[PDB]
RNA sequence: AGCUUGACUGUGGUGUAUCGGACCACAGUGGCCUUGACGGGUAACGGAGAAUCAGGGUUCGAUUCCGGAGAGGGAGCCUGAGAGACGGCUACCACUACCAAGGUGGGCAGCAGGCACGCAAAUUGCCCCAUGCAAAGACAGUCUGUGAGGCAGCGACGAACAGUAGCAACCCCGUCGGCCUUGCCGAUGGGGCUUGGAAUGGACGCUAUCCAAAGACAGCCGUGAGUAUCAACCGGAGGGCAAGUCUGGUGCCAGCAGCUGCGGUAAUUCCAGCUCCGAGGGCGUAUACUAACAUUGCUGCUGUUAAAACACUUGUAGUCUGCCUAC
RNA sequence: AUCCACUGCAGCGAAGGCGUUCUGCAAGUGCACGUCCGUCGAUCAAGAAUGAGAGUUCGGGGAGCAAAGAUGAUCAGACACCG
RNA sequence: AACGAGAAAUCCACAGCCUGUGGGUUCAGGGGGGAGUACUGUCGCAAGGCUGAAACUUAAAGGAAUUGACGGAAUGGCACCA
RNA sequence: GAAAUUGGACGAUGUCCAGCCACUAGAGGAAGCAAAAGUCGUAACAAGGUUGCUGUAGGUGAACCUGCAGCAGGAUCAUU
RNA sequence: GCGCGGAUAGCUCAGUCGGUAGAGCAGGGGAUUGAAAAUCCCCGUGUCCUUGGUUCGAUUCCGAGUCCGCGCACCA
RNA sequence: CACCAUGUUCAA
């Protein structure tokens, strides 16, 4: 910190960021159609000892 | 301004939106009985909480009081005709049993998917919102309707439809011509 | 204690009316000074003009600077200093510029970090804030 | 904390449609008040009702039905059964329109519409078809009127019901059950990819139907969907609180964050990408009020030290007050 | 001016408060009782009477102590503790 | 010194008989500040008493108790890094 | 039977006066609050280095100091 | 109304009278820090009003001369 | 019982 924050650096990050574009987007489902999607993806793909796993589980990374 | 027709709202939002308990039962019956959101689900649980306290409130009462006479008649013929309970289970006391299950099979798209008209319960809702299916000789269209015992031995394709005896739909009809 | 007996409906609600003046809330709803006094004469949004830019220094443990504008209301012509929402955002916001502001989710006390500043902006030039923010729409000319 | 001087009562009149200090003439000195008079305030039109509500209660009610008041502010009237009328008149005030300058006018808090004011609210539509009302008047020959009222347009206020896909074959996956030492085979079953036979609604069409006339709905044995491009979103992912110790950038900066907190070069919280969670044709935000709240406590709070027993007796209003009276 | 020791898990007073001895004046509680009255009571906004010390007012008094002030130390300062 | 009560300290002829909540009555409180402030009223010679807000500000203030640390606190041991 | 005449009432409206309320400008004075790293002290928390605090009075750069009386919420539940 | 003072990096300012240049503030870079704050180093930066003769250069010599402050003063 | 004042911000 030689300089601390000033009204000449609004927008600092948002200017920053390097602007990785979204992907292709295949449709979403939705209503019943997503409905049964997370019926499945939850209730009968089960491994039944550690009970429902957490959705969003994601791989290891330098945290660990 | 002067227009007196009513409306009223079917369901009621749940305190504790984020319960893991309702949360994941709601998702199990949902995912059961083929259901597009939470509010399909929420209007049974409040007919069913207005039947419940109905019987509650009539229970605290005696038998021969004319409103146990008129209000709990009303609610076994009501549960009775709607096939929430049998002959046998045709007291307030198992009208208190009542449980949204009891309702959601009275569901219209459950019978057509149990009468064998529909391969799964999805497959039915899309051919009652196709409108494929009579109830009796009325054409209905909302998977939603709460078939009555008598009106559930009439459940049967639309002659207008092409499954049974109809004229072929837009993919067979350019098909064949 | 309070009276019991059977002829105390009085002294029990004269009681109760007087005393319902320590709650703070229901002071406050009745007490007719809050719809003088705030600069929202009890209401949720108002529109104002943009006087000045305002850097605030966050009160500890942190160490930011708020970026804030104060805006003068055309209503009352009272002078407030509400808050600009989001990352940027204060690049579309210059002098002149008409901005509705509302108050922060307190009804009238400030949130986090910001010292005194309760209000925030949700539009400017008659476009949302954060359709600015979110690319949505562009400013007027 | 005192209020009232036609103020309160009486007698005789007046006036009125009628009783009455309603007004008058003469007499008297009354009338209300800590059970809050008089005054002040309006997040005051009142009620039916609305939202919650175990119970007790809390808050709101401009708004459709009933009552009141008003028609720019006042006031005075005529006509009439009925008006102190305002789509009646008269005058003054405040604004204002036309003018040939002598004169004439105005009244949307009716319906559309415009300017202002604002956070904030629609078409200068069609019609009397329905509901009613009025009149010298059933209908037709021979068009009663009706911005009441109806129907349309605009209308994510707010409600209700549906859709945004379904079934099966190919290829990679899991649980069960066999053969078998584990491994392999079959069976429902689930994800992503290709391929099939279908299905259907939106959208357009009809002078069929609907309609006072149209438009839309309903109907269609009229066409016709594959990236079914006819392509869902709004908020989130440390905790409360469902959901990532993921990858890049940032480096107490930008920013987030209702609260706690996050950010100081390895950010589960910022900016994004991917993934996931929640409600879903909706979701977020702000404001107000309700519940939570037994944090206004009648039910039902607390007062030694958390907020709170008057320094202490007395004492009026107020509140509360021992036992007893027929087989 | 003040009444040491006695002087205390002592007493009294509504509280504030009250301590040498003799004495004037009116009073209170408690106790005792086959005394009298016969509900006349409890608590109390308003109201009223007492209310340490400080403070003020008018007239005296002034020993001791002592705000202010003076003043010597201490201290970096010290119109503070201490004298 | 029991039961009971209490957040506990503690209370104990009460601070008990309280969610198994109601003998009667008066006063006061509603997070912390701003503030016992301003204005006004009233009493006083005055000092001031009584009465008494709001704008605004803030997520803690606070109470009892615990474990450690500290003490120019006490007691008792000790060390030629005293 | 019109204009005109006289005159009682109702009473708009103008002007003055009084009271009250609401909003508002103001030189200057004085407070309150808020904002990482400005100055002077160390008043409090331990016996906080003069135990602390209450009421009042006086003094003082500021915290504060001192007097009188009280309190322990004290650092004493305790000595013919 | 007559008469007196100085403008020096982006700002406050001491300048060898008649040899031509400097500090803090101001930004960056480094050292320090877990990150800062204070601190220490390194790097920025100036026709000194407009001008005339110009001693050798006029910033320092004089006079006109923006801008901004101030004292002197008439009597009976 | 001479005198013995002080310790920048967040973080732990």
């Excluded at chain 2, 289970?89 to 949204?100: A, F, G």
């Excluded at chain 3, 105390?8 to 809050?34: C, F, I, P, V």
């Excluded at chain 3, 910001?114 to 979110?134: D, E, W």
Aim: charge should be positive; charged fraction near 30%; aromatic fraction near 6%.
């Amino acid at each position: 910190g030689k300089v601390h924050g000033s009204l000449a650096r609004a927008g600092k990050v948002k200017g920053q960021t390097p602007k990785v574009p979204k992907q292709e987007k295949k449709k979403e489902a939705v209503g019943r159609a997503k409905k049964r999607l997370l019926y499945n993806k939850r209730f009968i793909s089960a491994p039944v000892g550690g009970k429902r796993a957490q959705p969003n589980k994601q791989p290891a990374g330098k945290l660990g | 301004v002067r227009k007196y027709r009513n409306f009223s709202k079917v369901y009621s939002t749940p305190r504790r939106p984020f319960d893991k308990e309702r949360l994941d039962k709601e998702l199990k019956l949902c995912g059961e009985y083929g259901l597009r959101c939470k509010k399909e689900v929420w209007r049974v649980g409040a007919v069913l909480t207005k039947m419940r306290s109905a019987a509650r409130q009539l229970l605290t009462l005696e038998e021969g009081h004319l409103r146990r006479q008129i209000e709990g008649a009303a609610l076994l013929r009501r549960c009775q005709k709607y096939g929430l309970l049998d002959e046998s289970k045709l007291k307030l006391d198992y009208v208190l049993s009542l449980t949204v299950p009891d309702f959601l099979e009275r569901r219209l798209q459950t019978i057509v998917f149990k009468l064998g008209l529909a391969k799964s319960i999805h497959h039915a809702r899309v051919l009652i919102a196709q409108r494929h299916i009579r109830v009796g000789k009325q054409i209905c269209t909302s998977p939603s309707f709460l078939v009555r015992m008598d009106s559930e031995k009439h459940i049967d394709f639309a002659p207008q439809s092409p499954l049974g005896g109809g004229p072929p739909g837009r993919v067979k009809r350019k098909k064949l011509a | 204690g309070k009276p019991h007996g059977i002829r105390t409906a009085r002294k029990l609600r004269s009681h109760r009316r007087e005393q319902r003046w320590a709650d703070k809330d229901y002071n406050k709803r009745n007490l007719g000074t809050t719809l003088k006094c705030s600069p929202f004469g009890g209401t949720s949004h108002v529109k104002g003009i943009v006087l000045e830019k305002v850097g605030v220094e966050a009160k500890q443990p942190n160490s930011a600077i708020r970026k804030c504008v104060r805006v003068q209301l055309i209503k009352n012509g009272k002078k407030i200093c509400a808050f600009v929402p989001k990352d940027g955002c204060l690049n579309f916001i210059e002098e002149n510029d008409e901005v509705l502001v509302s108050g922060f989710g307190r009804s009238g006390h400030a949130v986090g970090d910001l010292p005194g500043i309760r209000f925030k902006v949700v539009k400017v030039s008659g476009v949302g804030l954060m359709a600015l923010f979110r690319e949505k729409k562009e400013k007027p000319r």
